[PDB]
Point group: D2
Chain length 500, copies 4
């Protein structure tokens, strides 16, 4: 028969095998992990605050006529501050999609600015990668701004920016203003203020969240580690646990703090994963901070501030292997470069919820592309290098392009977060680097036992996915160009020091 | 029905789509491309010459009792010059296999030296990646040397090398001597001399090679670009074309040079792909070099030396897109970082010939692992986070490990070139970065028409490969934690400026 | 006959020759250039607000009993976040002085943490260089913090930090909190607020400033470019120009803005020198911005915000050759990388004021050092490689050490900004690199005409400074047989 | 009374103080340290073999009519592979001299290719620094090649190279061929063979060398560490010590090897200073190697091959403090990074021999420069910012230029190794960084006792060298109101 699998929308997907039996400590980011912001309301709120900010610093009034359009941005686009393009690139820096403003640039014209349809993604001065869910409003705003200055006649388009009279406004300078304004929106607190004053509008709520976290604390420790301050965190978490019952209905409600062994605010991630700041214990009954740990009876509170990830693991008595860290952010090679053991990782990708719907509900699109590809192979079926034939594939290519575009638009104007045609995005490549497990939401762990063995799927290369495990009887001897015309004792047991 | 495909051992595998109709110029490396060296005779010859070299520079006589063992090395291993281990690592620097000498290190012991089972593959001072087919003898020799100094009592093992009396011999110093000696073997010409004096023993020969190259020159230009000098190249190529007939049997034999539009020796790759050296035209009737091009009638020869890849394309009148460059070496991002258009690429991986046999002839091994994995899923079938069950998977894991090791050993002691268990190797990752097409040999193009459209296979992520394109009817509403509780005009035609 | 030179405290010192005749545009930083903050009051103010910020985020109450000690910090020290040391290093990263808290570490134990008495300044993650005048309070605070936790009973000293029970607190973490608090004090305007509310206490005022700027404005253009906003710039600049007469005798007062052809606020240096931000005009009467220029009557206003160094140079019609940029900050070589000719530079270095006093008023210490060296050469005068004599030099070496340390202490506990003994500091090396001219203040341009040819002094090497041009067989090993 | 100093051509110059008393181990490079190659014969030999190598790989026959011109190259020039220029730059990458072939480029057109007269030396791919004595022939050859193709009819000059018809030949490509040919000439032993077959022509000989090394061997240990193999080392060292008497009068000759406690050949510097290669013993009578040490009687031999600097220091029982390493090569800061104390350094700089002759025998040129500067200060003596006077200085500036250029030409067409005008070269800066002591030859240690206290000379800044220690209200803008 076939392998049993849970329903698609409940699945946890496995990049690297993970024995959940061994997880003794579950760690959480808050933003977009426990506190999932409603889409597109929250993106559109960030957009407005940023636009409003730029206008009050001198950007034109026409900006206030921009409306956030959730169908345009995809996450992980690269902004080329030299030519002002949003780029969807693959794992190796090859261009997949190129948008100047809202104008999508065809392949040939792309080669003027990118002669090899390639970017050096390491040129951090030039290219800015919009990876986060917070980057989404900004991704759209950059396109809005490029489009407006392009089409407004008060400004003359040039290769690397706009002339306003005798003044040059480079794309890199505009981007600096957008970047400054997004920070300001977040770090002066205007967005949190608006968020907190209407939580029903802006934050998702779900009773399964206290349920799942209560089960996690039955088998291990549970901790929160957030860059937000305690005041914001308390307001958010109280809302998330505000039900007329506790974990199971008919049970007594209990405060959100009772679900955690350790609560860490003001984390200053990503610095948190280095040496961080000095750890201070927070006295929530007072609000007073004190570096270190309380010596007195106040030591039984669990709210902390600053610190480092290494320190938090000490407080929990949790070795790195024991920890599954659940969040929405792809971190670099910071944690594993350490002499200390790192955390295993569950990556929240909320966009996966819509993408799985495209995958399941648009089958007729996938079927047709498979059809067209099977027909194409039939047209070349018995041809080899002696054949002069040039089969007519013109129309079938045109229907391939037309079906593929239709699929793309099922995701949005910028296509799927994970691929374009046959090529994985840079983002997809980073998901595979960073995440041991991933899902639309951490809540999918509800549907798995804590003894579950998560087994990784082989990611197949072209010669594995298009060759069957069947014996191929060849009548001609294999060319010795291919075969090359083909003592330590062999190891007696498995040599895999990874176990995946 | 199913998609028609050529027989497995004739296939060209596609990472990135390529319209072969547009290829107007075919370029070749010589070594391990046109001139395929017999295995393991040629590896074993390189081994002996290197060992002999080290002995005459003071290394112990016991080295001459080493015999090359083709079942041990896999290509792409990393040599850690700090701890003297051969490492098989994945695309992200995670350890898969760790061999100190001929001792394979289990996972737990690995963590002493690699606390995160991770290496920073960028630490080029410490880690040396043995990617080439020429590296194979050296890969085995490094293991031989570590094993000998470990087990010989005249030397005391330490973490980073050996004590010989009061003298410390670091692994990094030993590696420097091995590296120096391999160079010497190649650059004083001892290996070419031995090769040339017994070409039947050392070089593969195949009549399909003149056939395929004659067909290529029917539709485009053909050129050779080799680091070897003309003298070696002539000896090799004359042997490769030495048949009592030409392209087709019953035709007149013709000299190998008649198969090329341009013959480039002394290329100094990889510098060749930068600014290179000054181009000089070679006068083979004389041997005299002259920088530039001959003004007189000698300008009708086609042998050149030095130069750059940009210059060679000018001579051919070949824009970069028009060129398919066929060879065995994975190059870095050198060619695409240029403002000039780069070559498309066909990668020769000779090991693919044995790997495809494992894939097809050891099906019963693959079937069992699929069985065991289907049984494992059955054991967790109706469990979720409320379940207390801990199903007994002990024996079925043991049979997984035992079957997986058996598969590994079908490839060699160091396993497949492309994966370990569920993880692709670093090498596999580089194949996907660099090669538009790849095969065990370029001769497989014989079985494809020159109008062929090579269409890339999707490389599927876990949520694509383990979810069907079937409509999933859910009775419970999807958690808004996953859905988030979900103007420019949309593009009307495909936006893919890559076309793959 | 000897060369004429202006009086020492009026001099502009010349590192690279500069023909003032060609300067047609004069550009100023404001902070510590036009607005010289009184020392040590201002450092002490920044120190106190930073300590209070730290205590308010949970640092111990004892910190509030630290008093800023201006005799301790010398600018340009390197804080080693690994071992908690303030370090004075030379141009090449050789150790000269090593302080742990307030304990000064001798040579031999220095070698335990620094085996070659060498740091790699490239290690930006480990070593933080405290080069600015704003960094002076933070330099002392770091020393205070390391001293406090080293001698506090509640804590256990370690190599890389301290234990508070079973909890480790790294110097790197602690330095991050000090770093964050100094930013916080500055970017909250706490410091700006206390400054503005008492300008006499914190800001130097001097009628020579309006005189010098009006003379520059007569020979060319003058521009201001500060990171500060307009409201703080206005308060400060209004104070600096608040005199009952204009710059000439019996002339009437005129506003500070009229001394400038272009006023740029919110500069966002150092980004300002690359692509910066988009330039916007400032309506001073309203305080509102508009990117570009106001399309109306307000186009005639001369106050802008943000922008870039290149936009401002084009706005003034000045090529890089025309411009002398006057300021207190040393910038990296990332403005010479541009493809248009960059500015020439005048580095304001306030410490030069007290350093020159030491140079001239402690001449007895220099003379004694010279005698001890002369006397020392006399001891070796008759010896070559054939000599077994080991002259007894310990007592004279003892006296050299005492005298050099006496000199060091005339500058402060960390010695001179520019050197320790025979070795130039890293800071001195960066002045040589960046500053075409330098003085203790820009005001010393008063004493020079705008046609002056500033001529660079040779920096002599040992084989130049210790052999005379006087005319005196030589080994072919030295001659290569020429 | 003035300070006693040894005669100028006998001096060891002191950059960092060094107590020779503490040196217990003396270590030598051989090439250009013990074996000083005669100039210009040796440079000319290397030049000719390199030209012939190039012509034999297809470069035009005209090259064989180049003659090495020793008056052109100064060591330490930077070859710009993009534009074909030899460049003399200062410590910070500022342009001082720019030669294209043999055409010297004035300031203003320099700015077309170098808008800030600045190069980024970090661009290792673009700029190649020609610092070694071995690099002198290649420095001139580069200039010859650029001059040849610029004025050859068959070629078309471009910005970054030349066209040979429809074919482009970049300076970068051409530089690669010169680079490869210089390696080829050296690593084929062509140069070593012609040297050994005529040692009188190419190698300086001097009986003072065996005297100095035997005196070192009496106070401590002496070691040799050369990249050369043993056969070439033996030929050369045998020649250098070939005298009818030993070092003392009427003493008998003894072999060169007996002057060394350890002879290391095949050093593979600079890798030698990291982990190097495995150390092997050399059986001199046989020429065979054995890694480690011979387990027999040959263990008493003192000739090794390969190894590392750390292995050799442990072999001698010398910590880094004990060692003075004597050599002609400037190394990067990648030996101070080690976790054991590194060597102290003596940099042999042959050009110092002729440079000191210029310093003392062209004093009239220095005096005139001094008068012109004094006279120039007198012209400005009475002017300050109120002055409109623009004194006429063109004729005196003209004479300064002529005189400075006259001085430059005493060193050679590229001027002094250490400076151009008021600006130290990049090379001078690297001597300051790397060399604790330096002289024109190691032989000047003869004139100093092994108990000598080498004392460093202050390198004065402009505000130190041009204001007297003599005692002379000051603006609070300079004083910060102290």
């Amino acid at each position: 028969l076939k392998k049993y699998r849970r329903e698609a929308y409940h699945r946890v997907f496995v990049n690297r095998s993970l024995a959940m039996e061994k997880i003794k400590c579950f760690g959480f980011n808050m933003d977009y992990t426990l506190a999932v912001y409603k889409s597109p309301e929250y993106e559109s709120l960030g957009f407005e605050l940023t636009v409003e900010r730029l206008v009050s610093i001198g950007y034109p009034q026409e900006l206030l006529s921009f409306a956030y359009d959730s169908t345009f941005p995809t996450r992980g686009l690269v902004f080329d501050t030299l030519y002002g393009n949003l780029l969807k690139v693959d794992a190796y820096g090859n261009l997949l999609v190129c948008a100047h403003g809202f104008n999508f640039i065809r392949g040939p014209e792309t080669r003027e600015q990118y002669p090899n349809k390639f970017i050096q993604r390491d040129d951090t001065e030039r290219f800015y990668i919009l990876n986060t869910l917070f980057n989404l409003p900004e991704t759209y705003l950059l396109a809005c701004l490029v489009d407006f200055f392009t089409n407004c006649p008060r400004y003359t388009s040039c290769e690397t920016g706009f002339k306003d009279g005798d003044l040059f406004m480079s794309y890199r300078s505009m981007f600096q203003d957008v970047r400054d304004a997004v920070d300001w929106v977040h770090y002066k607190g205007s967005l949190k203020e608006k968020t907190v004053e209407n939580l029903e509008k802006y934050v998702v709520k779900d009773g399964k969240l206290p349920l799942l976290l209560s089960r996690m604390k039955e088998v291990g420790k549970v901790f929160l580690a957030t860059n937000s301050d305690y005041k914001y965190t308390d307001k958010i978490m109280t809302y998330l646990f505000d039900f007329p019952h506790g974990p199971k209905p008919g049970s007594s409600h209990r405060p959100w703090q009772s679900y955690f062994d350790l609560i860490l605010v003001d984390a200053r991630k990503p610095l948190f994963f280095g040496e961080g700041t000095v750890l201070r214990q927070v006295d929530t009954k007072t609000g007073k901070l004190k570096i270190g740990t309380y010596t007195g009876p106040l030591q039984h509170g669990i709210v902390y501030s600053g610190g480092s990830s290494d320190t938090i693991c000490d407080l929990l008595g949790a070795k790195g292997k024991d920890i599954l860290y659940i969040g929405d952010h792809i971190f670099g090679d910071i944690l594993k470069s350490k002499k200390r053991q790192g955390w295993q990782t569950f990556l929240v990708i909320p966009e996966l919820a819509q993408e799985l719907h495209v995958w399941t509900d648009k089958s007729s699109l996938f079927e047709e592309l498979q059809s067209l590809d099977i027909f194409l192979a039939e047209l070349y079926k018995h041809l080899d290098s002696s054949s002069n034939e040039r089969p007519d594939i013109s129309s079938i290519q045109r229907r391939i392009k037309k079906v593929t575009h239709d699929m793309d638009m099922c995701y949005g104007m910028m296509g799927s977060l994970f691929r374009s045609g046959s090529r994985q995005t840079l983002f997809a490549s980073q998901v595979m680097r960073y995440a041991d497990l991933y899902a639309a939401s951490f809540i999918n762990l509800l549907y798995y036992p804590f003894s579950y063995l998560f087994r990784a799927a082989h990611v197949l290369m072209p010669h594995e996915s298009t060759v069957e495990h069947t014996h191929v009887d060849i009548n001609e001897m294999e060319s010795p160009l291919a075969t090359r015309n083909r003592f330590p004792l062999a190891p007696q047991e498995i040599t895999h020091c990874h176990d995946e």
